[model samples]
Structure formats: structure tokens, C-alpha cells
Target chain A: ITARTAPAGGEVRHLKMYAEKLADGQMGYGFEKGKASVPGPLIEVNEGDTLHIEFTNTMDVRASLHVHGLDYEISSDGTAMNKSDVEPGGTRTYTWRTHKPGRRDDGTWRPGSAGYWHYHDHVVGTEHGTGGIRNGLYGPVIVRRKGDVLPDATHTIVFNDMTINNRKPHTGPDFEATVGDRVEIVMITHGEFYHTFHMHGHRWADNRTGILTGPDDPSRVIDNKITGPADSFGFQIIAGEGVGAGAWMYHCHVQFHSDMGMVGLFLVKKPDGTIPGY
Target chain B: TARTAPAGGEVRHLKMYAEKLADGQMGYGFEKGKASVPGPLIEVNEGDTLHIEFTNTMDVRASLHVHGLDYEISSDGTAMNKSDVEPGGTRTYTWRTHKPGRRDDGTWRPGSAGYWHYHDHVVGTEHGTGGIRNGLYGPVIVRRKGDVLPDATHTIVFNDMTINNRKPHTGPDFEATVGDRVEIVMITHGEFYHTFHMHGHRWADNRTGILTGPDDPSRVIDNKITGPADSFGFQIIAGEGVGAGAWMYHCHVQFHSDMGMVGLFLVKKPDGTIPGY
Candidate 1:
């Protein structure tokens, strides 16, 4: 399946999503184009655009894709209450519209009406329960503003059962970056647990949003923050700022989670240098 | 025990009505009339006198033990002299505060102008009292003479496996608005240990009322481990530079948090207020 680009001029972007049993030795349900894997794939779009998803349930169970933190009609609510179930070998379509920040009565733009969001299966064995999320039926959906500065590198870290991005322990992918690069870290949590994301050697200025800012703002420099189920925190940091280029550790502060393998290395190299071969 | 005279300024005579109350499905709260797990907050200014008239209505023997305060041996309330009051009994305890300052010359002085907590010292076995585990604690704030009072104050006690007497998702959310100076006091009791962690916030020196100068240094951190009989307090300007939304504060112990030791700190927009007041 080819990646769909942004729709041109008022057209709706269409995506074909499939839900099926993962391959042998793999645990849990997954989204697939041809093969199944945890954390399906990214559903990227821009603000003010419409997303049309054609979902196919290839499993023997009922399943549906439910969008989180996005606007959709009741027909597409996709929860057990909505009875949005796709029987075995059945197909359904979901429509969602990315919204722009609203304005006050005086026409001032409202804050916190936009940012990164996510989507996952909401109906299955337990009917809108963890049966789907606990399996591997979740992924990210990014909605960007018109002129937002895109990060040079992006990494998504999901915490569930003390696993990082569906990989056990240090087996996950290393987030790579170059000096002075604008890096965006999308932190998410799944299942019934809570976690704190801590990146060694680099700290964000503001603690409330984890966003880096200028010195003018009271520098509440912090290297860690907590997140709960379905909660998402997106922050950008200047890679290798005020630190030497090397592999830094990023892991959950909950000692047990880290002990259970919820950790990964973040490699930052000099602007014109190469990383040492491992 | 005899009550002490007022130190100097106005004397505050407060009554705490301790009784048994139910907290949803979590457990019972030894509180003062509808005072949930952690009882009502007791706020006082520096250099003031506090006269607590505690009335216990629970079946078990009880008494008020105010931690982090200066008092005479009679006011200790530790049942050292068989002072534990019987059920349906009333007792009074007096406390005085000494504010931090300097003399005519440039010299350092110590004060009790900080966050503290109070609980029942008579419960459970003599050593591992289950009274606190069953919910009977609250915050005590002593501010400087002219310091600006916080817009909001929240007290969280980590008792057993509950947060403020209720299991996770069953407790109340801490609410505040952008730029609101919110003060949080965390107290830990019972057998197990825990840590307080808040998303998107940190204290300048991680001074959760733990250690003060001269020896131990205050290190800023987003999470800190707190043990039994330990308490910490810190302040944060809600949404100072960060945007408004529902943030989470919970124990860092994965097992404890996963077992419902978590709560939310809802930060609303500057002009947006919380519904239902």
C-alpha cells in the first residue's frame, strides 16, 4: 500500500486500514497492509482537512477503528455504545475532520484546540475495553497547523506493560538526531499503567507542557514528566544543545518499568560528524 | 494536659470533629464531618498560636498529633503518658510557631514558615499504626507574616494503596487556572513506600519540606521517593509557561500507581473556569 499524500484543495484524504491477527510467534491484533505488526502505521494529516478511513476487519472477531482526541460524527463514534462493529471479513468506513483552533466572541484564537492525537480499536471481545489496546491495535495520528515548523526528526515512544514502542527492553529503535536539529518527541501511554518519560542530558524549559522556550520565560528546566493511559505529550528540543554529541539514555522513571525494559538510547551526533560504529 | 497561653498575636481556637465516614468504595475515612481521607486543611500564619480542640467520635482511641510543629511534651499527643483519648472523648493541644528571621546584626535564623501535616498518633499496633492507613490526616500551612498566600492549596496523603483515602480514579481532581500559584503537600504513612510525581511541573530545589540547608542540598526533580513517616511540600505556578489541560500527579511506584494511586491536576485556561465551580 502506498502512503497517501495530503489531499489537494478541499478533497478528503482516504486511507485503507486493515485489522487482522498478527503473524506466528507475535502476540495481539495488529493493523496491516500485508503483514500485521503492533502500532500499525502513522495517520498523518493537517489541520482543517478531512480524513476518510476505509477499514477492513480480516479477523474472526468484531473490531472498529476509533479516533481519539479528534472530531467525528456519532455514526463514526466506533465505540461499543455506537455498535460500530465490523464482523469477520466485513468492511466499514470512518470519517473524521481535523479542526482548527476556534475563536472567542471577539475573534481571538483559542488555545489548546490542536496538536498531536491518536487512534485505536475500541470494540472487540470486551466491547470498547482493553482487549483491543492490550493487543497491538493502536497508533498515532498527527495534525499540524498550516505554518507549523516541522521537526527535523520525530520519534514516537509508547509505554505499555513496560514495553517501549512494542519492543522489549533495549531491542527498540534508537532515536537518531544531529546537532542543532529540531527534534520532536511524541510521548504516549497505553494499557492501565502510568509512566514518566525522562531523557538524560537534555531538559525542556517549561514543565507544564514540556516545550523548550527562550530564557525570558522562567526556566523550569526538567528532564522528565508523567503520562497516563491515552494521554499524549508532544515536545520539541534542540538536539545536542549545551551537551556533547553522544548516545544518551531515555527511559521511564518508574523503576519497575525501566527494570522491565521500558528504555532506549537517543543518539545525537555533531552537525558534521559521524556516529561511532556499534 | 494543661493548655498553654497565647504566644503573642491573635489566638485561633479551632475544633476538629473526628468521626467515621465512608469514601466511596475505597474504605472509611477518620475525618471531621465529611472530611474525606485527609481531613480539612489547617492554615496558620507565622508567630501565631494554634489551640486545637479535638473531639474524637470513632470507636478506637484517638488523639491529634500535629507533625512538624513546636510544642511542649504535654502537647506531643503520642500517648507517651497514656494521653490517648477514649472514644467520644475531647482533648486540646496547643502549638506555637517561630518565624525565620535575623537579629539586629546580619545573622541567620530558623523558622517554621513551611508546609506540614497532622495525623492521629494513636492507632494500629504501637509501632505500625493502621489509623493513618485508615485515613486521618490533613495539611498544616504556616506562612510568613507578609507572604502572599497561595491561590489554592492541595494536600495528598499516600496511605496504604490509596490517594487521599480513595483509590485511583475515585479521588477528586486538583483544579487550578493558568498562573495560579498552587501549593501541594504530600504525606506518606503506613507500611509501603511511595513517591510523588507530577507531569509538567518541578520545584526549584526539589524542596518538598525534606531537608533545609547547611548539609543536604536541594536538587530539582520531577519525581522523588517518599517513605513512611515522611512528608514533602512544594509550590508551582500552574501553567506558568505551559498550556492548560488535564495533567496527572501520582505515585512513581509502577505497582502503586497502576493499583489506583493516581489523580489529576486539571489546569484550565486563564479565562476558562471549571464547571460546577
Candidate 2:
């Protein structure tokens, strides 16, 4: 289920997810019914929809699912501060009410809280949510606004300590797109450091992601941007818009992180829609 | 001669000793008696003359270079082609502060006064050589008429991933009164760029130090990014209208900060009391 469209007003949606020990010898937790991946699954929802997630904790100890960037009540705040720990074999349904942009009587538009976000087990870690993210108990969530352009392809790249998507450089999945395809890149970070995402031979307005001040503010245009811990940004890029089709590299600009294997390639297919070397 | 104002202006004669310093770790500093990572704070008023006599006492050669001041080429101290002071030598630098304004006759005025810094610039050595990275840089303030005096002034130099020549969690804490006006003068030196971020209080602009003119709007910012050979200074009313507390000030560059570029600013209560006090 994709959250690319607006939901009916006051509609309620429910999702079920379970956390279990992964058998891949990585000493990590993965979502069930999917053979356990580093990034469990994409949870998409439209603005103004009420989401109820029935999270079952099947791990050895305590765990809870906490979604970032969503408006939720105290009961849904799955952090140690709220004591929102789900013991082994226990299940809890966390509720969150999505936000949407609204207009004031003065004709001023209040922007909706729509962007790319992620969720992880905040209560299962001893290092302030670090343990869960380190063990691969995290996934992405996207809240889309109405009238937003649909992307031809979407890719989520996570930056953790010396790892990208739990894999070394050139080992992670290659983000593929057609020569003229519109691609959306969602980047998130979870570690003690900061990282700058640089896409070779590509540039976008600085305000395209992060906090949007105005739509037409021609301030900065750069191919590299920095993201701190827990910072997320989503930007749209047209593959081969002004350049020829080829394999472009995307990775952290930090020299040490790149050397430690936080890198990957973005494959832009030929005009005939064929990936080179494949 | 002193920097403190009398009636209109004043002349200040300052002595800076370039020597070795010890604060758990050995480093270099510019001081009157004992050296500090950041040298002694040199305060002056607009339209004042500052006569600085520098003495190099360290084993290696050294010289003093004052930034953000107006002076003749003879006092530039960059040692581009001129000779710098050898060990156990002394030199004198004379400078005059010019206030930014027009005369009563509407003639043009050239000098803009602001917070600045000074450091060691020895020839044939790296910028972060022992003379600077160890200690040597200090803050310099040139205040205009009727400028409010801060209750406390702190000079924080971000250099070589160290705050004021000391590693994070090991440096001294900046203390202030709850209602005191605290002025932080930040200077950047060394190889890389750095952004200074403070928790709790934020400036309206993004701290880019961009001035407003006829066609531009002034932006007030809380964080400021300074590169090598750059300096920025901003004032914050302690407590943000709140009570006493300890806040953090550090470089926003995660790698540099995580390495050792962090410190704390402690604001005491109105009664001059602190949590541990």
C-alpha cells in the first residue's frame, strides 16, 4: 500500500508488523513476513489519515515502534521517557493522526507536515535509540500531500556509522531509473555524526528539501548537502534531465565515511530503457 | 595609557608575551605573565590608539599578528617579505581605530569597528603551528560610543578541533550571570571551516554575518560558520529571559565537534548562585 494519494477525511488505517530475530547471522531484528531486511518495509500514509499500527514484540527482550515526524499522543511515543516498552510476546497498537496543510482566515497557508520520515525502536536501546538502529530495526515512512507529483521511482538511502543500507560500498542496492524518469531520493541518518549527500553531476535548489521557506527563492543550488543526525530530506531529480545517461555515483561527502564504505551508484538507463553492463 | 575610556578617547599600551603555557597539556600562549591558549582580551574604544609591545620568549621564533584592525603596512606582521622576530626578541605594533560614520561636514569615514582577534603568524611555519594551535590567538574588541558593556566577555577560538586550545569536556566553562549580557567573540583558525552553534538561544538570522543595505534585508542568526582566517562576534542576553542553567556551545560540524570542539556556558541565578554552588 502506497501513501501517494489523499485519503478520505477522517479515515482510519491499520497495519500489523512484528519484530523478530533475523536468521542472517547479523545479530539484528527484522520485520516478519518479509524474510527480515535491514530496512523492514515502506510505510506510506496520506495526510489527515489516522494510522494505527499493531506492533507485536517477538524479540527476546523489550521493544517498541516509534515513528518520527508524525503527530501522536503520549501513548504512541515509544521511547524510554514514556516507558513504552513492549515485553516479549506483547502487542501494542500505536495511534497517530497525520497532519495536512491548512489555510488561516487571513488567507495565510499553514504548511502541512509532509515529508520523508523513519521509524525505529526507541525503547529497545540503551544508547538512546542507538541500539535499535544499529541492529537494523528501522524503516522508512512517507507522508505525501495532495497534488504532489508522483515519482517514477523512489529510493531510500540511510546513513549510519560507516555503513549504507547495512552494506559496504558498491554492495548496497543500485538505485535504477530510466533516462527521462523522475526519481525521488529520500535520505535519513542515524548516528553520532553528520553526512553530506552528494549526487554527481546533479543539482537542486537548497530549499527543495529540509524546511521550505518559499517555492521561488533562488538562494542556493548545489549537488552536495549536509544532514545531521535524525535529519531527513526528500528531493526530486529528473534522471538525465540535462546530462547523458550513465552511471552516477551517490555517497557521503565525508572522506572517512566514504572510505569506510558508505557509498553506492545510481544507474541511469539508456534511452531504450536498458541498464548498461546488465 | 589604557583602553578604558576617560572623557572622549584613550591610548592603550599592551604587552603580550609569547611563551609556553601549561594547562594539563603544554601549549603556547600570549599573556602578560602567564600565557593562555587564547591570549588576553584586548578591549579598546573607537578612535583609540593601541600600542602593542610583543616579546617572544618561546624556544622557537614567533610574532604577533592582530586581525580586524586598521594599521599601516609596516605593522601588518604577516612577515611576507619582512623579517619576523627571532626567539628572545621583541617588536612593537601601533594601530588606530576608526569609527564608521560621516563627519559633520558630510565627509566620508572609512573604519567600521567590530569584534576581531589576533594570533601568531610566524613565517616558514604552518598556520596551526605550535605557536597558534597550541595557543596564541586572542580576542580584540573595538566598541563604539555609548555601546553597552557586557557583564562578561568570552573569546572562543575554534582551531584544530579544539576549543580554546583544549579538547572538549576538558576545557573551561564560560560563566555568566542570569541577567548579564554575554558577548561571545568567535574566531576560526587552522585548516578547515567551522560553524558555531549554541543551544537554547538563537539569533533571528542564520548568523551568516551578512549586513543589510538598501536592497538587502538584515538576517539575524543564532549559528555562524567561520572559515580559516575569519572571525565573528555576537551578543546574547544570558538566560533568554529564563533562569539559571548550563547550556552547550559547540561546532555544528559533527566530525570536528565529536572529536573535541565542545564547551559549556553556565548561567548563574540572579543571586549569583549555581546548581552546584
Candidate 3:
């Protein structure tokens, strides 16, 4: 959920500063806090400009930074083998260049496709696997393509497969949707379990999954070719598929996981329910 | 001892003995400790003469109101409809059970399978909770002569949905054997709206009316089985084939079931041969 009430135009930005070293607190049901390494929000970069992220580790632990979908050199990929961990009170700077066909600086634009693309801590030997993303350590880094009209209403969704106080996973506040318009949904998961997301009335496609193989570092290339089923990657849907339109449910197929909290609504209302500014 | 009517017996005297409001209550039949048993089953044959004797044993004067039974308006249980029965007084009501109106297809129009109740129909006692809850209500079962008893019969009683006697809860679940025709007798002891739902089974609302004539209507909406505080009789065949299993019948009010107002019914195979419990 966006804590900031509303953003008034000028390039909106948010910084998620972490509290001093205490283990990750308990999140969704079984997972404990401090197990995963979460980093501050990724700062937006200018088109064709060097994107540098200064990561500071104030906790008595090690951490690193991994930019989500940007293709770049192996050394700058932030993978465990090529990562430089910032120890307690230590700091490291991650530098990258956004010089691609479909890349932008503002982290709000969708790269002409709808799905989740995010970043997390990708360091080894530390609880980086469970903590970084599981804790509160990631955010969206959108790179918009040319010619696509800016959405009339732009919203982002964060998906997590966990629970607190034994409460079921409930979707955040109500959202309005009108006919003949498009909606963009973005989601990411840090835990080990893979979530099969299904939207009630819409289909979202995946733009990319953040995976890096170091080839002498920084230079990583964007690969569109995904192995296995396309639907399993990033979700993509057009109006109706097979048996169309009605009240439906969207959640991870894993009953327990979805019940925990990784769920939301995709309501397709009649034309009359729509209001101005929606 | 009151005689227990057989499954398909002829019309019997379904009596509601009245006691004067000895507790100095405002109206007749509103007396405390009037009848030890508030409500009893009033059984009668489908097509037989129905006779009832209502005796007044207390100081107050009152009349009886047999809900959902059609008889002579003068002999109706409404307090004003009949002469008030004073202390040590008794009045008898007799009527023949004629089937309700039928449609062209031979099916009875707005007909009832069975299930009704009686209460005080006096002027002042009519609106208070005393008549319905204190001790002036009973079940009236009009059975079809010679009809076979169900393989398994169950009575589902609905009480105030409460948990720890402090908070309120609503939804409850019911279970029964697949393929077994089940009858659900939903009774409300308090004034509350209850949407009784038997998950996985669609029930047929036999009959439900507060007065004798076809005034109050039964709704056919899905999921919720609605009725007033009096009583409602419903029959349903459990799902067959693959859709068969332990089903649940509970109040759809959601909170009721979470409270202590919920219970489970097991629908097992006939010969008790079903494996998993």
C-alpha cells in the first residue's frame, strides 16, 4: 500500500529507510523478520544516464542490491558471486546505465506491458534470500516505452503470501474501473514459494524476471525468451478468455498461500458505475 | 400422557391448554409457568377432521391462535375471532383438512407439506415476547396418510446465536448422508432474522404462514431459507453421484455459525458402511 496520501505531480519519489539492526520481524504467518534482507527503494534514473544506488547497511549484517529488469554488464548485476556486501555501518554504490530501447527514468511508467517487475537484495551467506524481499525491502522500477498513452488512472499492487494475527489475506482498499479503459497491475514475490496469480476479470503479462548470470560483471542483457509456460511467468490477458465475463476470483492457486494474503480484486463493472476522474 | 400419533394417522385432537395470566400479566395466556412444555408437535392426517380443545386454567381470559391452519373464521385461534376462554373454561375447535388450491398441473398452489405453530392471539398478549417464548407455542405436523418414514429423520433447532453468552454469532453448518431425503424443522426461539442454509443441498419450502389463510408467502430464493419466529418445514434430497458428501446446514448470517449456534450432521451410507468418519 502507498503510505503517502497523494502525490502532487512533480516526479514523485519515496525512500524506505530501514530501522537500526534488529532481526526481521514476523511477517505472513511462519516467516520471521530479519531472515530476509530488504533494501531501500530503487532511485529513478534518467534516460541514457548512469543509475547509481547508494546502499547502506546499518544492521549488524551483510546486504547487497539487485536491480530488477534492467539488462546490463555482469560485474554490475549484483549477483552473489559478483556482489560487494556492505557490512555493518558500511556502504556500497551500485551504478547502471539505462540505455535501452524501452527504458525510462521515472519508476511509474509501465514498459507498454502489464505485470510485476521489481528488485531485492541478491547477496549470499546472509539471510538475503528470505529477508530482503520478504521484509520491507523492494519497490517498482518502471521503464515506459514510447507512443503508449499514459493511463488515466495509475495504481500499483504489492503481492505477499503471508499472514498476521491469523487474518485472511485481504486486498487493499477499493478501486474503481470503467469500461473501454486499460488497467496495469504489477506484483512481485520474495519468498521461496512461487505464486500463480489469477485476476478475476483481467490477465496480466510478465515483462521480465530479475535473474542475472555474471560474465565479468556489470554487463547484463535483457532476455525476453522465458522457459516453460508463458502464463506461469508474467500474466497477460485480453478482456475475455474461453468462457467470458462474470464475478470471478483472482489468487495464487496454492490455497494456503493465497489464503495468507496474496489476493486482490479485478472488478469489471457495468458502464453506469463509472464516475468522472475514475 | 398425550398419545403419540403414528406416522400416517388420522386427524387427532391437537390441544393447546391455556392457563390464565396468574402472574398478573396484562393479557390472557401470558401467565408465568403456564405450561411446563411450551410447544409440542400437533400431528394430523392429510385428509381428516382436525379437532382441538383449548382449556383455560388461570385467572386471565384469552383465546388461541393456530398459525397457518384454515378453519371456520369464527373458530379461528385469533383472540377476537372466538369467545374468550376464562379460568376453568374450555372451548373446542373442529375442521376438516382440505388440500390447498391446486394449479392446472395438479400440484397444490401455495400448498404445505407440514409444520406450523400456535400462540396467544389476545389483544394485549399478541405483541409481547411472552406468548411466543414464555410457553405458548407448539409444532403442528400435517402428514400425508400412509407416507413412509424417511430413511433418516433429523430435527434442526435454531437458538439464539451466541458465543460465551456475551457476543453474538450467526452462521451454522448442517450435514447429512447423500441421497437421503432430509427434513429440516427450523424453529426460532427469539425475534431474529435467520437465513438457514444447508450447504450443497437445495431444500423445498413445504409451508410457512403465521395465519391460517394463504396470506404469508414462502420465498424460493437460493442459499438462504427464510421464515419468521414461528416455524418452517423444509425437505431436500441430498446430492447424488460425485457431489455427495458431508454437507452443512447453518444460519447464513455468518456470525451466528461462528458463535455456539452451529452443529454438524453426518450423512453416512445406509448400512453404516461408509469408511471415513
Candidate 4:
């Protein structure tokens, strides 16, 4: 077999995507309705390519397609505040454009959209899809430049979880917290690849400290995050918040990565270090 | 801060040697026959320059190629550029570093404050597959002013599958007392990737491996993945939060860890006893 190299790209393209609920209670995006699977699907393009996506939400709940590393309008922002979500059985069109590196008129270097990117849903469980992405709602994107080297085959190995049980789980290292204590959690990722860590009840802003920079800081609030290797973000939760006592499950959300047991729990109690119902 | 580094602008010189150990491994040291694997720690502050008169006491051509320092083409330490010293030859190499400051164009220039290392670049495979495999490497640290000094420091190198070129199923145990600040210089070289993990301590993932301040956003992590030629350093307060134990540190990659890339950070109680061996 002969290895083919990518020629120059300046094409206009259109794709139809579907958000479906899998039988195992997970969710995904796919090129066709019944084909929806975890990690959605790979959407590869090139510099100077224009892409228009017709996204249909086949799940009963409303969801949206949020993307990274491309040019798009606020109307394509794919968040609840931006009013870009898709109602169940409804469809929305998103536009993304790419460009090659060049010199701008203002005398600075403008880089091309050539990178490894991520895309996921933005409206499940909360505005950031803590439930959706955890079940199975993310995938990879590759925007290549002209004359780029291509892999013979590609695989997306998403590593997710708290820094682990490593041995077994259900046997939990359940961290205990009371209703009014300032409970801090330092989240970190290690080994081999990236991951999405999800906690049950509370949420935190996605920033350097995982706490809000300030009220005016526009850092997105998220619960499920797709984090990379050597990454650590920490935050102190005002334990139990508005919701009271409960046993919250926290784990990796890359489906199989979760299945392998990178998991634990946060047991929030009421004033004593004891879970109320238990 | 417990002892911050002083500002630097000094020129220093040293006499060094490259020799073959009794077991045929190669090493570099300040004395003729005192060389050990992973050499010795070569440290300098920012804005300093160093000159080393290196003598190849062995019977083969050797060269010194270092990382993250400023040097001219004549000191690249490679054979392709005709810079490797001949057998039993002597040569002097110069390395310089600068402090961080604003550039003339109003951009910020980062200084050479980092965890780095040096190795023979011209032995066996031209890239030193033979030299490094035998032990022709050592640690380097460049510090910026005001960097916190550690009470103790250790170097851990994951060279391919070996930990500091250690034999399988056995390694060194670093010791410290509770509350002592410890620094570790971690470096990786060779073919595979490894994740460095410590059992009970964490450090800020930045140049100095300690948080600069409340607003410094570097992650505090206990485990990290690294690849070939990558080096990083960190300082952890001994036995903090979880106290006084025979804490384990190892390559977290299952296959690698299983292959015995393991060590113990012996954080002892002030009374001089460790819990549960």
C-alpha cells in the first residue's frame, strides 16, 4: 500500500451530526442517527476549510455542540447563556472556519488552526454537560496544515478519573465532609493520557485555581472536565451547599476508563463527620 | 522563605575528569577517579557563567553536551561539528545563563532557571546510546534569585527502564525528618515514557516546583508524566498532611513500575522511628 500525503486544502464542506442516547445509559454524537457512540466521531479538516454542521439532538433532553480551536460566532457558542442549545428533536446549524498562518496588516503573526482539539456537549446535567460528557459525549478533532505527516491509524485514548483506587473500587477512600466546612479538593491527572473527572452534586468554575477569579471573571463553570497529563486544579467547596446530606460518587467519565475503576466518593454529612441517612 | 538564593553575576571555573569505573561504566567527576554515575550536581544561579576544563581520562573520544544553557557551536559537544575530544584529550567548555528581564521590544524574556542535565553526546551511537546507557550523565540546576533553598536535595533519573541506571528490583532510599523541606530533581532519558508519582506529597508544577505566591496558578500535583530528555524539579515539605512513614515513590506506569522502578522517601518521625517499615 502506498502512503498518501495531504495536498493543499481550501474546500467547503457540510456534515450532519446526531446526538443519541445509548442503551447503556450513555450519550454520543455521530455522523448518522443509529451510529452514535461514545467519543462521538472524528471530524478532520484542513487549514482554509470551511465547515457547517447540521446537528440534531436525538436524545429526550436538550443539548448543544460546543467546540474548540476554530473560528465561530457567538450564535454558534453552544451554551445555554448564549441560547445556542438544541431542543429535543430539534436541529441547529453551527459554522466553523479555519485559516493558514500569515502576516496580518497590523504587523503580527497570525497562526493557523492546526492542532489537536476537543468537542463535547454543553447542555446536559448542567450548562457544561457534567452528565452528558461523563456518560460518553466527547471526541477529538485534528486540523492539519498543508504537507503534514499523517499517521497510518489514529486512536483516541482518553484517560479519566481521580488519582485512583488503582487496585479495586466500591472499596472506597470516601472523603468525609460536614455541611458547613470549607471542603477543598485538589484534582489531578496522571499516567499515559488525559481524563474527565466528575463529582456528583457541586460544581466549580474552570480556572487556574478552580475558584472564580472574581465575579467579573468569565471563566466557565464546569463539573465534568477533560483534563490532560500533569494538570491539577483545586477548589474549596462550601460543603453540601444548598443541597444537604448525600453520598456523591466521583469517577472518571471516559466510559471504559470509568469501568476500570478510577473512582471514589465524597460523603457530605450534617455537622458531625457522619453521613445523615447512614 | 527559608533561605532564598542570592543574585548572581559571578564567573566560576572547575577541573573535571571522565573516567571508566571499575565495572566498565563511564562517569565524570571533579577528581581523577572519584566519578560516579549521574555524575555530581552542577548548580549555578541565574546570570552566572561556568568554565570546565574537562579531561577525557578514558581511551575513547567523549564530549559534554548540556541542556538549557547558552553556549556557542564550538561547544555543542557533538562529533558531527568536530567538537568531541580525542582519546585522553583535554578541552574547556563554557556555559552561560541570564536572569529574566524585559527585552528591548517590551516582551518578557524568561531566564534559564530550570532543572537540567548533561551527558556525552558522541559515544557509541553518536547520540550516546552507549555512553548514557553506561552512565555518562549528571544533573544541572539553574536558580533565579529568591528561589527557596531546600534542606536536602536528591536526583532521580529514569534512564529508559532503569532508575538512575539501577539494577532491577533494587534502588536507593532517600531519608529526611518530618517537616524538613526536600527537593528532588527528576530527569528522563532513553526510549520509553514514564509517569513519576510520589505516595503522600505534592508540589507546584512550575519552574521552582514551589508555589510562587497565592496567585501563582501552577498545579499542585503528586504525579506527572514525562518523556525523554525532559527534566523538572520540585520541593515538598516532608511528612506534611500525612506524617512520618516509609513513603513510596516510583514510576507509575504499570509495566515500568512492575519492572522495579521504585524507591522510598524515608520520612522519619523526630524521635527517629519510621512507621511500619
| Model 1 chain A lDDT-worst window of ten | A1-10
| lDDT against the true structure, each candidate | 0.65, 0.65, 0.42, 0.73
> Which of candidates 3 and 4 reaches a greater DockQ?
4
* Backbone clashes under 3 angstroms, per model: 3, 7, 48, 2
Worst 10 residues of 2 chain A by lDDT: A104-113
Model 1: clashing residue pairs?
A207-B200, B168-B260, B208-B233
Per-residue CA lDDT of model 2 for B208-252, tens digit only, reads: 222222122222333455677677776665664234665556675
Instruction: State how far residue B191 of model 4 sits from its true place (Å).
Output: 0.4
* lDDT of candidate 4 over B1-277, digit per residue (tens): 2677899889999887889888888998999878977888999999999998989988888989999988888888999988788889999999899999999999999898899999998778899888888789999999889887888889999999888888865876799998887999999988877778775565656677765444443444556678788899988768654567766677765446557887888888899887665
Specify the poorest-scoring 10-residue window by lDDT in model 3 chain B. Answer: B209-218
- B38-152 per-residue lDDT for model 1 (tens digits): 7778777677889887777777777677777778777776777565668888878888887667867989676676677777777665532766766767778776654444566
Model 1, C-alpha of B215: deviation from truth (Å): 38
lDDT against true structure, model 1: 0.65
TM-score of chain B of each: 0.82, 0.83, 0.60, 0.98
Q: Give the 10-residue window scoring lowest on summed lDDT in candidate 4 chain A.
A: A158-167
Model 3 off-target regions past 4 Å?
Answer: A1-278, B1-38, B45-47, B58-63, B82-84, B100-114, B122-124, B143-180, B198-227, B236-255, B264-277
Report residue A164 deviation for candidate 2 (angstroms): 2.1
